[PDB]
Write an enzyme that holds these catalytic residues in place. Structure first.
Site, PDB file in Angstrom:
ATOM      1  N   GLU A  34       0.841  -1.199   0.000  1.00  0.00           N
ATOM      2  CA  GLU A  34       0.000   0.000   0.000  1.00  0.00           C
ATOM      3  C   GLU A  34       0.887   1.266   0.000  1.00  0.00           C
ATOM      4  OE1 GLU A  34      -3.118  -0.021  -0.443  1.00  0.00           O
ATOM      5  OE2 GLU A  34      -3.865  -1.991  -0.089  1.00  0.00           O
ATOM      6  N   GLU A  85       2.411   0.321   4.540  1.00  0.00           N
ATOM      7  CA  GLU A  85       2.133  -0.705   5.518  1.00  0.00           C
ATOM      8  C   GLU A  85       3.261  -1.695   5.454  1.00  0.00           C
ATOM      9  OE1 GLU A  85      -1.522  -3.072   5.288  1.00  0.00           O
ATOM     10  OE2 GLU A  85      -0.757  -4.427   6.752  1.00  0.00           O
ATOM     11  N   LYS A 136      14.845 -16.018  18.283  1.00  0.00           N
ATOM     12  CA  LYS A 136      16.287 -15.912  18.450  1.00  0.00           C
ATOM     13  C   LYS A 136      16.788 -14.503  18.605  1.00  0.00           C
ATOM     14  CE  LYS A 136      17.441 -20.005  15.727  1.00  0.00           C
ATOM     15  NZ  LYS A 136      18.286 -19.948  14.492  1.00  0.00           N
ATOM     16  N   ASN A 160      -2.040 -11.073  20.441  1.00  0.00           N
ATOM     17  CA  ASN A 160      -0.607 -11.338  20.569  1.00  0.00           C
ATOM     18  C   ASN A 160       0.036 -10.125  21.253  1.00  0.00           C
ATOM     19  OD1 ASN A 160       2.082 -12.034  20.382  1.00  0.00           O
ATOM     20  ND2 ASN A 160       1.978 -12.450  18.168  1.00  0.00           N
ATOM     21  N   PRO A 161      -0.306  -9.955  22.545  1.00  0.00           N
ATOM     22  CA  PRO A 161       0.145  -8.750  23.268  1.00  0.00           C
ATOM     23  C   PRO A 161       1.650  -8.637  23.374  1.00  0.00           C
ATOM     24  CG  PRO A 161      -0.918 -10.315  24.765  1.00  0.00           C
ATOM     25  CD  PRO A 161      -1.225 -10.771  23.342  1.00  0.00           C
ATOM     26  N   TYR A 201       6.821  -4.186  19.381  1.00  0.00           N
ATOM     27  CA  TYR A 201       6.734  -3.061  18.467  1.00  0.00           C
ATOM     28  C   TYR A 201       6.799  -1.748  19.233  1.00  0.00           C
ATOM     29  CZ  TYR A 201       5.935  -6.115  14.449  1.00  0.00           C
ATOM     30  OH  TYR A 201       6.051  -7.081  13.518  1.00  0.00           O
TER      31      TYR A 201
END
Ligand code: CA
Ligand code: CA
Ligand code: CA
Ligand code: CA
Ligand code: CA
Ligand code: CA
Ligand code: CA
Ligand code: CA
EC number: 2.3.1.57
Lengths: 169, 169, 170, 171, 171, 170, 171, 170, 170, 169, 169, 171
Positions: H74, H83, H95, H126-127, H133
């Site tokens: 995008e 994105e 790892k 998926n906290p 992030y």
């Protein structure tokens, strides 16, 4: 039964598909084009590669023996329905793989493709197949009269269905 | 009733077809491509002009008023079957034309195209249509559950059929 | 007719051809493709314009009224044979044009195209047509059983022929 | 039972072309005359999706190529087709012909669902005419000077058989 | 009831282009930027069979063109699309917006059978945000410096509504 | 051869054809296009593969040595005529294959293709070739004056013909 | 002097086709047989850049169409071509033929720079043969059963004339 | 890692890409076209080779083991946004490559492509990924409700972003 | 202006463009192809319709008189730069439209397209034009020597630029 | 002489070009393809529209009467040379326009196209044309023997040239 | 000298052609398209394979060593003229092969192609080549001034010709 | 003398692509940005007959690939082009640069017959600027924030040299 996996049909699997057709010995179709030869199958595969109205998958065991085919056709993305079938190779029939294959097809249909309804046709003269499908949660919704010309006569088929809400909930 | 004739759909009739679609206000298809606009309809007509898997006809009266549409789809020339429908324009509904149109479609299907079987779908919530088809010799072979998303919910349809041997003999 | 003339079919004659099809109300073909609509007829005419395996001609009177169609199909240039048919427009049927049109088609076939044999099919259940063809010099060489699905049943047709040598020596 | 029928493929075109040079008459593919393997190959590719003609090769248990079964002029409204069979010279006279003919009729009437199959046989090959009659074909025409073959126009019988006879004759 | 929705056609492209020059930001057709009527026309022809974007024109009883309803990024597996509405300047402020929004949701949820529709609204247009909230849309994002518009990066609300809310909220 | 056989030209024979051209050292043509190189020959073969107006054949002995080429050009399927030529490879010239090859070409022309007439051109300045053709039943029907520019001058050729009826009654 | 030669154009194809139906034998365009105006038109478009055949129309001072001059089989190495002339029925017998023939030779020998022009004439039209002889053509062949015309094979004279004779005969 | 390198995706990497898809077992897309097979992936790669709206890169270690994929889709060249997503091969998950790969993608995005903003989607369920992030400088700007049908149900995703100015000033 | 408006070039404006070319009487280019005729201009417009590397606009007054052309070429979407030029129709030269047109081009470039830099070339031998551009905020960054062959000799041009940050802060 | 202007040849000028050819009555070429008819001229114009190896221009007066044609062919952009010719329509010959046309062609060639050398061919049997060209600064560089077949014989032509440095300096 | 033969250029000879170009180190052309690379040469060869306006030939000895190239360009089939050149590979220069090659080119041109006139260009600064051509019967018909940009300056060339009537008679 | 210049070929594209990944800025082929070998290869094929850019590879006596000489924006009316040179990292600092630059100028001015060649050099690479000045290039511009390179807008010198200087400076 755990060791059976589903993967997207590829060009190298067309030999397998064509061998499945010679064994069943009725007219086969690819996006509604009848075909008899490997060469025409190959060309139809190339021509419809980007068409999402039919989707095919191969079931393999842990050693990559080809067990069978899962096929969805007539896929409609507004009504969210498709017709399916499974074909198990003759040498792997009667090993109890059918149920596993059917579950893999439903899983793909209802957890990946997000379809609402799947239906299939079963020869009324194969009551044991009809029973198997019923045991996997399919319900008869039609007894189609003289629907298909098979082995020199018109035969009846059950149309059997199952909904995403039944399979998931 | 005698003065109603069937003729092959032409490019100048696409306006009529498109007006029939706006009035019914559900998703229409041409060779399985969904379309909403006259422009896309026109292009699909041109693209599939030589495709024999679907055939369309217009019913006109003696003064060439357009009465309705006769459509065969899913035509299979091995099993010798097709799905049909008829659509009568709103202004001509309820004049007793339906029966005549149905007979013209059967006549074409069974005396020209040489099909074996014709079937159609009718909304289970339109019992009067179901009855009409039964009176023209169609028989219920399926009650398809949650087959089509129409007006915001999945609805059931009867699948009704008639054979060439019944119609002709 | 004496002033019936034959001329090559053109694109402006396709309406006439399509009107002839609706009137006869059986499935029509162009280079083996079935068609029902004017639009598909037009597209098939354009697509096969350079194909010599079928040839079509329109018969007109002195005032250019369209009388009928002469069609040669399955033309084979080695065996030198073709299948012929004629369609006369409803309003001109029974006026005594048929024999003249047949002779014009044979003339073209045997004096221009240099074919050896022309054959045609006639419904066994139209014995008066069969007789007419016999009077124009055609001979029955087969009675094809359940050859064509026409009006809801399989029908028999006579296959009738005539040779170049017969026509050119009459 | 030993003899099986399978769809013609591109690797069988050599066989087809060898059958043509042996018979030494003009061959056709979708009405186009051809004489060379190269033109045969090109015509095969060009008409691959055409259903108006269908071809099949007959093999024995060791995959020796026995012959060819060909349907042409297939019309899916009249439900008719023209058939022929060509047996390779080395396999002629071994009694394979009737088996091949039955395989062609079986396919034509139980898979393709045709109504009528017909064929042409040289009036000067009365033994072939007889064979076809024994397989249930009936003469419906004696076509006069139909084909130029070996330097003269020859007559052929047109013979036919119907689906209902093949499928139900024993009922 | 006066206002009807119909599929965009080639004769409506002039209207579309006039709507673009009025709003004076960069317009897109299947992700291709365009500024001219000629490029718009060409893109319309090129993507005519693409179902990933769908457009509709809203007319009154006398066929005045009121506005445009556009769905883009239509995904038929996730069953989602992005929507926007553009009302012609002369028809703004007549109270047509809510009717148009309902027509777009109706099509999206009763014909296309989508699950989710979302839209972007300038955080600096709080009255539009409010309107959408009144039609049942809920804020699910406040996208930071998402779009360069009029010489600076601006924030937009992302708002959504689900099929189940639109169809069944009254049940 | 008795075991000279004729077979349809194929793509693997184009090298032979091109070697025949270099040896004769005049301008060669494929469907009226002049060519000098193997590459252009190959491309013209591919381009005209479905064209029936020229047909070519290679003559081989029992061990598949390439003897020569038989070519029919200007084939007309209405008048039923064609122009024929033969080229024998240098190493096989003068061995007494020519008459056999000529008869094989006539056989194909008159018993398979069903042509009416075959004609050929022969250099007036090769009277022994003219004689040979006369002995195979060809008759002179023209002496074409300054017909072809060959080796730096315009040369005369005899046009010789033979008819199907003559060949088939011999 | 009244009569001028000009390159055939698309608007002259009607004239050409009318000349064909009058003569009532099979016509060809770059060796393709045709009978209809539509096929003529298509062949004209398809071979527009082909120099192997060239056509010209002869008109009078008021632009009445008199006839056609055609060169075919033009070979630019041997420097030869086949010619014919067709005069419209209404203009036959007015003494235009010799003028047209001179115009064709002039073009052939002074513009195209050909070496040899030849033509075919029916042996059963001795007056045409004579005319051509008077224009300097010489018989070089009497082709036997060359053409099937009106239901039988007919003989034609092949006649020729060379550039050097046409240009220098008077020197 | 220090010797993780990023390189442009090539046709010989499509097998790797397809193996990454089978392992994650959700519907994958190439320029918005869904695909399941290697063959369709290959054809879509060829078809969109000149399209700049998506860019892909493969991350390798010093011995050229394939670690993962970096994808920008995008891409808008006016608003200067894209994105991003990452897929690490199963055997290399956990790892401690992820943060290095993320920084390589941001580096390319902000120092070569000159984008203004990069955003990504992460499953709300998926906290630990969301946290990762955030630790790499991304900030939540939306919680998209029932955004994607994944494994038999509609799932929520966080939309997370980071700006060029933040990355280049760190 | 106040009522000078800018609008996207359309096919019906090509006559105007071509009249602007004949008047200036130097070689004109469309996506680097030189052209002299209306016909070639038209064909190049059709061929490059989807190319975003050049963008053109026409300036009109309130009564739709055509005032001039604004052209951006060499648009680079990574470095975010473009070359700009203006042509005012002869009859509208010297009326005080130039500065307004320049501001409209900068506005589009910096508020819609989001470019970083615009530069232009001006003949060193047109010092009054150079001055005008300086008064509109452009700064000389080069004096390109013998850059263009114009009217029979190589001429020098100033290269002048202005940045988005300068324009947006004025 | 001042009022004569040069403009790029357009599609509507092809009639003029073709009329100039019929009048001169020798073989004409477009990008080396010989042509005789307006139809072939038109198609060659369309096919070579983007080819810069030949360039054509029309000379008009103030009332847009078509005076003649300026043609450059064999344009080579490395050696910077081209062959030119001018053709004046018969009705405008001998009015003293030739010199003006020649100057307009040189101006374009040397001030716009930036060529180095222009050359032309003139029939040795037209000594007055040769003289005119000499008066405009062209110099004989060749007397080409039997170069062109014109009116039934091979004729000689002068090849005349002029350099950009002579024209401009 | 007897053992040197001419044959039509083929695709496998393009390497040789390209090596001849690198050695001469000036701009080469194929049907007027400039090229520098083997790849572009190959593509131009394929694209113009059916074009008869240029013809090329390779000269080989008895052991198939490649000696040189004979090239005809600008071939006009109405005027019956062409431009020629010969290029001998550096390793075979000065062996006395030039004369033989020139005779082979004339033989082809005048006994096969039936041309009327052949001409060539020779650098005025290569008087020994000029002399050689004169000895083979070519005559100077032009001294073209500043015709070609070669090695950083415009150079003059002789244009030399010979007629079919001289060569054959 | 050891170093020779030859036209770029398809087998050199690997080298070109390796030069790009080393320099790690966005590369272009006829103005199309590319990052992969596959896209490079496709662009090479697509623009093979385009004369607006020309590329050459410099090799030593043993055919080691030393570097690339590239001309872009070639305009055959103004007779100008943009040049650059890229030396492979392993061959940098061996004193090859000046030889390569002379080979590029020689080709540009003695074969292509261009009038002017110019190049861009990072103002932050004063040693490169100096080198070019020593080869006779002169600064004609200091372009401000011309290129986004390594995360910021950087200035470049534009430098030029004329044909007359290169060819005649010694006369
Ligand atoms: Ca098929
Ligand atoms: Ca659609
Ligand atoms: Ca053939
Ligand atoms: Ca655009
Ligand atoms: Ca024809
Ligand atoms: Ca021509
Ligand atoms: Ca080139
Ligand atoms: Ca790219």
């Amino acid at each position: 039964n755990s060791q059976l996996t589903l993967r997207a049909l590829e060009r190298g699997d067309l030999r397998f598909i064509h061998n499945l057709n010679n064994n069943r010995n009725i007219m086969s179709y690819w996006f509604e084009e009848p075909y008899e030869s490997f060469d025409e199958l190959e060309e139809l595969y190339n021509k419809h590669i980007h068409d999402n109205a039919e989707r095919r998958f191969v079931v393999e065991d842990a050693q990559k023996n080809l067990i069978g085919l899962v096929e969805l056709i007539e896929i409609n993305y507004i009504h969210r329905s498709a017709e399916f079938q499974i074909i198990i190779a003759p040498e792997h029939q009667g090993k109890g793989f059918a149920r596993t294959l059917i579950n893999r097809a439903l899983d793909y249909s209802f957890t990946i493709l997000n379809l609402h309804k799947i239906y299939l046709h079963v020869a009324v003269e194969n009551p044991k197949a009809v029973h198997l499908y019923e045991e996997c949660g399919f319900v008869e919704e039609g007894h189609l009269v003289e629907e298909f010309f098979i082995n020199g006569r018109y035969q009846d088929v059950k149309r059997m269905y199952i909904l995403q809400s039944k399979y998931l909930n």
